Every structure is written in structure tokens, then in C-alpha cells.
Amino acid sequence: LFLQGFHNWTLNPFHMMGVAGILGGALLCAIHGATVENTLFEDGDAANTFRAFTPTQSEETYSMVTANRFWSQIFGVAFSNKRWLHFFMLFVPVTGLWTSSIGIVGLALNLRAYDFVSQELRAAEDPEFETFYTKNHLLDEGIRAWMAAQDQPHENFVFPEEVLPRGNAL
Amino acid sequence: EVQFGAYLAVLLGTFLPALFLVNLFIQTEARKAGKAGGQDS
């Protein structure tokens, strides 16, 4: 909450890359698990398909061809190379984290992607222009002003009631 | 309003790498076609 309020960290593109990478990693994990588990081969006679596998096995346990066809018919593109598939699974979350780290290093120097100057101006010279962006800015100002007093006790911040920004009756 | 230098940044950063990749693919396909005998030399 502190980084959101003071740096507008959600607006930083590197954070967007990081969240894209993390969500894509979770997506890849779930989809690969489901695809492998739902394309198993008939290697037993019991309903429990877990006991039809042995670690010292040479042949493949699931039909790569059938999974490829299924995903190419449903989605439009599908994997056709297990090595590339697993390298992609490795690659996505790691690069997401690296991009997020670059963004945080940028924040450490207060070089934050806080304001869109054009929109800030055009809103300053006309009190009818409004976007969700300006609403986020108002939320940031509110959280900052109401949180600073207790977040930083060493500064001895004292804010009278008439100074704190507040909206209407609420 | 907006910076008039971004235009160049955005457009060049979109076009130059795209043409570089298209070049790589085209030359790969041309070499592949040249390796196999046929109407293409």
C-alpha cells in the first residue's frame, strides 16, 4: 500500500511486465498439467491412472499428437516441441521477475512513472475532464495524507482535521 | 500536450526491429530454397 500510494507502482510498466510474467507462469503450469493428465495413454486396466506409470520407462505416457491437434483446433496455435514447451515454461516467470526488479531499482531513486503530464495539464485547464487515471491520483493523495502521520512517526507530522483531504459527507 | 519526439521513438522502434526479423526469416527461407534443387536457383 505504501508503494502504491507514494510511487503509483501499479502504473509502472515494469510492474505490468512482472504481473504478466507471473500470471502467464501460473497459466502455463495449470494448462500443461491439465493437457498432460487428460491425454494419457491406455497403459492399465484400473480407473486409477496413477499406477500405470513406472519411472524406468522409455515410451511416452501421453499423446503429443492428439494434444497438439486438440489445442490447434481450440485455440488456433499449439506446441509441437516438448523442449521448446518446457523452455517457455522456464522462461516466462523468470523474465517477469527480472523486469519487475528493474522497475523496483528505478523506484529506489524516485524515478517513478507517476503522472501523465498531458492529461494532468488538460485536466488543470478544464474542470470537466475526468478519467479513471485522475481518480487513481485522488486516491493516492488521500492514502498518502492519511497514512503519513502514523507511517513515519520520526517526522512528527501533525495534520489538523481541516488540513486532511476528505471528500463529501463520508 | 504530448512530446513530439515520441512519434519517432515509437515508429522507429516498431518498424526497424520488425524489418530486421522479416529479413532474417526471408533470408532463411531463401537459403532453404536454394539448398533444395528446383526452379529457384
Binding site: 488456433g76 496455435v77 | 504530448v2 512519434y7 515508429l11
Partner: peptide
Amino acid sequence: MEALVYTFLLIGTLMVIFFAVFFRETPRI
């Protein structure tokens, strides 16, 4: 005037997506 640039970028991305589905390398066994 930047709305034109944004629209061009979005439509170009959509066209790239279009070409990657109907003009893909056919995987053969």
C-alpha cells in the same frame, strides 16, 4: 493525433495475431 498511432499499433498487433493462426507452419509427423 496520437489516437491514430494507438489505433495503428492495436490493428497491427491484431493483424500479426491473424497471420499466426491461419498462416502457421504446419507441423508434420
